[PDB]
């Protein structure tokens, strides 16, 4: 499944998101992206909650 909820994923995700362009990248990408990378639904809002996007969750 690969989608095993892991904190290392969150850390890598937050880095990814707030690196530069990902914050400006549409969530249409970001949603499928994190979920396919291995983050469950819970984890994807976790990463976005920590990074603080607060837009189209």
């Amino acid at each position: 499944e690969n989608v095993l909820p892991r904190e290392p994923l969150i850390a890598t995700a937050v880095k990814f998101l707030q690196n530069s362009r990902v914050r400006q990248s549409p969530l249409a990408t970001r949603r499928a992206f994190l979920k396919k990378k291995g983050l469950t639904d819970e984890e994807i809002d976790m990463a976005f909650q920590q990074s603080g996007t607060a837009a189209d969750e």
Binding site: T12, A13, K15, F16, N19, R21, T29, F33, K37
Partner: peptide, 12 residues
């Protein structure tokens, strides 16, 4: 490449 940006950056 933006595609690689999703890959390389999230790889590590």
């Amino acid at each position: 490449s933006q595609e690689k940006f999703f890959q390389e950056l999230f790889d590590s």
